[PDB]
Design a protein around this ligand. Structure first.
Ligand SMILES: CC(C)CCC[C@@H](C)[C@H]1CC[C@H]2[C@@H]3CC=C4C[C@@H](O)CC[C@]4(C)[C@H]3CC[C@]12C
Ligand SMILES: CC(C)CCC[C@@H](C)[C@H]1CC[C@H]2[C@@H]3CC=C4C[C@@H](O)CC[C@]4(C)[C@H]3CC[C@]12C
Ligand SMILES: CC(C)CCC[C@@H](C)[C@H]1CC[C@H]2[C@@H]3CC=C4C[C@@H](O)CC[C@]4(C)[C@H]3CC[C@]12C
Ligand SMILES: CCCCCCCC/C=C\CCCCCCCC(=O)OC[C@@H](O)CO
Ligand SMILES: CCCCCCCC/C=C\CCCCCCCC(=O)OC[C@@H](O)CO
Ligand SMILES: CCCCCCCC/C=C\CCCCCCCC(=O)OC[C@H](O)CO
Ligand SMILES: CCCCCCCC/C=C\CCCCCCCC(=O)OC[C@H](O)CO
Ligand SMILES: Nc1nc(NCCc2ccc(O)cc2)nc2nc(-c3ccco3)nn12
Ligand SMILES: CCCCCCCC/C=C\CCCCCCCC(=O)O
Ligand SMILES: CCCCCCCC/C=C\CCCCCCCC(=O)O
Ligand SMILES: CCCCCCCC/C=C\CCCCCCCC(=O)O
Ligand SMILES: CCCCCCCC/C=C\CCCCCCCC(=O)O
Ligand SMILES: CCCCCCCC/C=C\CCCCCCCC(=O)O
Ligand SMILES: CCCCCCCC/C=C\CCCCCCCC(=O)O
Ligand SMILES: CCCCCCCC/C=C\CCCCCCCC(=O)O
Ligand SMILES: CCCCCCCC/C=C\CCCCCCCC(=O)O
Ligand SMILES: CCCCCCCC/C=C\CCCCCCCC(=O)O
Ligand SMILES: CCCCCCCC/C=C\CCCCCCCC(=O)O
Ligand SMILES: CCCCCCCC/C=C\CCCCCCCC(=O)O
Ligand code: NA
Length: 388
């Protein structure tokens, strides 16, 4: 039985190193958004709420974790707060992560209404509500779902605790049914699975929209060929009718409108000549469409594909963030499930408990790195900030 201060010393030093790094990186995120108007958008207001939660892991939840690892004598309700505050911060992260995912789904599914529907003012109201809800969920044990009514009095007396105090230890005061059913299943795993569903819808929508862009391009070009080797006016007509419909369809910014105006106009010219039974004149007219395609429609296609690919890249960055939160927190939640559902199983050993706790805390360090590696406007703003 090694002096407890030695293992304690390692755990505490590591927690402190994590806290420094969580503060530094996430302050840098907040400073970048504050300084750069190109980063000031609704998506990034949720990014900042998430960075604030991670700053608070460093300033408060890690000092609290260090404290409760000592098992110091405390009033049971003050102990609860120490124990549970980190659950407020985690819940808030889950809400910011779910908000980010929904925001990106709206942006790809209804880009036309996104700006009128998702506003900064509404985003700030939603962030305030989510913080209130996170306090309610994470401090639910302080509302009575706790083990304070059943204190471990032999353990309190061995440590010399005073009357009404307990040894302040996480699994002595926080019920494991709360941790597994309420906190993990309902409040963590359900949201994370919802996030997964949303990201699946974002990526399927992008892939549908890119395939439609290419279809339309291919349709335009096939129908041109159809026209070229048509032999009677009626065939030219049918293929122009399909082109016209697709054109007004693809229509759904001045240099872009002028291109589709030319396009539809030239189709109409050709249709009219076809309807008068002037096949050669119609085919020649239709050939002019090639100039418009080269000088306008291709540029349209290329910019639309590029916007979509940017949205896909951005949605992957956001999903990496959500996936890393799951990876860092799931080991602890899974251990709790073993403790709870398998009372015939030996408790996970202390070294693994503390490993799982610091892994969860490390999540508060990783997001600024994902932003720097994957989002140029962040990377570049971090550079300017650091260089200055
Ligand atoms: C705004 C920020 C900086 C304020 C942080 C205040 C924190 C540190 C305060 C607020 C509530 C406090 C707890 C309230 C009650 C008790 C019970 C007592 O037997 C041991 C201390 C303990 C467990 C306190 C520890 C310190 C505590 C957690
Ligand atoms: C990649 C992430 C999401 C998955 C991590 C899975 C981890 C947490 C799993 C894999 C194997 C598991 C261990 C398997 C066996 C035991 C022995 C039992 O008496 C206590 C629990 C304990 C010690 C488990 C704790 C949780 C555990 C370490
Ligand atoms: C990973 C994502 C998809 C979902 C989360 C999976 C969780 C809920 C699963 C994965 C492994 C599971 C554990 C595997 C083994 C046992 C031992 C058994 O005696 C009690 C249930 C218990 C402790 C399971 C509880 C639930 C569990 C922890
Ligand atoms: C207890 C409260 C202490 C909280 C500390 C961490 C929060 C710090 C972060 C709060 C400020 C975020 C910010 O200013 O940047 C984004 C805006 O510019 C968007 O326009
Ligand atoms: C992801 C989908 C959700 C998965 C949650 C599955 C939770 C399943 C956990 C039930 C484990 C259990 O009940 O153990 C039996 C013992 O209590 C009897 O000895
Ligand atoms: C304990 C509560 C701690 C911090 C509150 C969280 C602070 C959250 C900071 C997010 C700020 C933000 O996103 O600002 C929105 C902007 O005003 C839109 O116009
Ligand atoms: C805005 C930034 C401000 C920074 C804020 C600092 C963070 C708080 C640090 C530690 C709190 C945890 C320490 C609680 C320790 C309690 C120790 C104690 O109470 O010992 C009594 C003994 O057990 C007999 O009752
Ligand atoms: N199970 C658990 N324990 C602890 N700390 C106590 C570790 C321990 C466990 C058993 C023991 O006899 C002595 C120490 N912190 C904890 N934090 C969490 C947590 C936060 C979010 C999900 O789980 N679970 N959790
Ligand atoms: C900063 C460090 C706070 C003091 C930590 C106390 C160490 C003893 C804990 C233990 O060994 O159980
Ligand atoms: C990321 C960092 C990886 C290294 C993780 C080391 C974490 C600490 C394990 C130390 C085990 C000591 C158990 C705690 C003793 C106690 O305070 O009760
Ligand atoms: C994680 C560590 C990232 C630390 C980045 C170094 C710059 C810190 C400067 C600052 O706090 O604004
Ligand atoms: C510990 C908590 C520290 C949080 C740090 C977050 C900093 C983010 C920006 C907040 C506002 C900055 C105020 C200084 C503005 C100076 C200026 O604009 O010229
Ligand atoms: C930026 C400001 C952040 C301030 C962080 C302060 C650092 C405090 C570190 C941990 C405090 C742990 C106290 C240990 C509990 C007492 C042990 C006992 O009574 O037996
Ligand atoms: C803001 C900075 C405040 C710093 C808070 C640091 C933690 C103080 C820990 C107090 C431990 C003394 C306990 C004495 C004892 O009962 O053994
Ligand atoms: C329940 C008591 C806690 C309420 C505090 C919630 C945090 C407040 C708003 C976050 C800032 C939003 C802008
Ligand atoms: C919002 C919910 C937060 C309320 C929890 C504080 C209760 C304090 C106590 O138990 O004495
Ligand atoms: C839903 C969000 C609203 C959450 C806040 C609601 C009010 C709860 C008041 C809780 C009172 C805590 C005292 C508990 C105690 O000390 O025993
Ligand atoms: C337990 C479910 C894990 C969900 C992670 C969500 C990340 C989205 C990835 C696509
Ligand atoms: C390396 C990081 C740890 C990797 C997996 C931990 C697997 C848990 C094994 C410890 C079981 C303890 C025991 O049952 O005696
Ligand atoms: Na977080």
């Amino acid at each position: 039985g090694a002096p407890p201060i030695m293992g304690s010393s390692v755990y505490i030093t590591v927690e402190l190193a994590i806290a420094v790094l969580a503060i530094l990186g996430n302050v840098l995120v907040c400073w970048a958004v504050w300084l750069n108007s190109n980063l000031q958008n609704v998506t990034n207001y949720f990014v900042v709420s998430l960075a604030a939660a991670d700053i608070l892991v460093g300033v408060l939840a890690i000092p609290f974790a260090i404290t409760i690892s000592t098992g110091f004598c405390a009033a049971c309700h003050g102990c609860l707060f120490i124990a549970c505050f980190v659950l407020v911060l985690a819940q808030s992260s889950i809400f910011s992560l779910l908000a980010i995912a929904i925001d990106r789904y709206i942006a790809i599914a209804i880009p036309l209404r996104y700006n009128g529907l998702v506003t900064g003012t509404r985003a700030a109201g939603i962030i305030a509500i989510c913080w209130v809800l996170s306090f309610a969920i994470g401090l639910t044990p302080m509302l009575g779902w706790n083990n304070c009514g059943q204190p471990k009095e032999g353990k309190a007396h061995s440590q010399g605790c005073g009357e009404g105090q307990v040894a302040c230890l996480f699994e002595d005061v926080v019920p494991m049914n709360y941790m597994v059913y309420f906190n993990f299943f309902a409040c963590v795993l359900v949201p994370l699975l919802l996030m997964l569903g949303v990201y699946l819808r974002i990526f399927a929508a992008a892939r549908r929209q890119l395939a439609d862009l290419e279809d339309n391009w291919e349709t335009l070009n096939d129908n041109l060929k159809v026209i070229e080797k048509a032999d009677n006016a009626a065939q030219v007509k049918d293929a122009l009718t399909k082109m016209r419909a697709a054109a007004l369809d693809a229509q759904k910014m001045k240099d872009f409108r002028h291109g589709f105006d030319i396009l539809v106009g030239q189709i109409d010219d050709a249709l009219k000549l076809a309807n008068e039974g002037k096949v050669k004149e119609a085919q020649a007219a239709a050939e002019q469409l090639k100039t418009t395609r080269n000088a306008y429609i291709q540029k349209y296609l290329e910019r639309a594909r590029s916007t979509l690919q940017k949205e896909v890249h951005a949605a992957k960055s956001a999903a990496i963030i959500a996936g890393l939160f799951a990876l860092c927190w799931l080991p602890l939640h899974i251990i709790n499930c073993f403790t709870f559902f398998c009372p015939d199983c030996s408790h996970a050993p202390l070294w693994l408990m503390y490993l799982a706790i610091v892994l969860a805390h490390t999540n508060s360090v990783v997001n600024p790195f994902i932003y720097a590696y994957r989002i140029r406007e962040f990377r570049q703003t971090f550079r300017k900030i650091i260089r200055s």
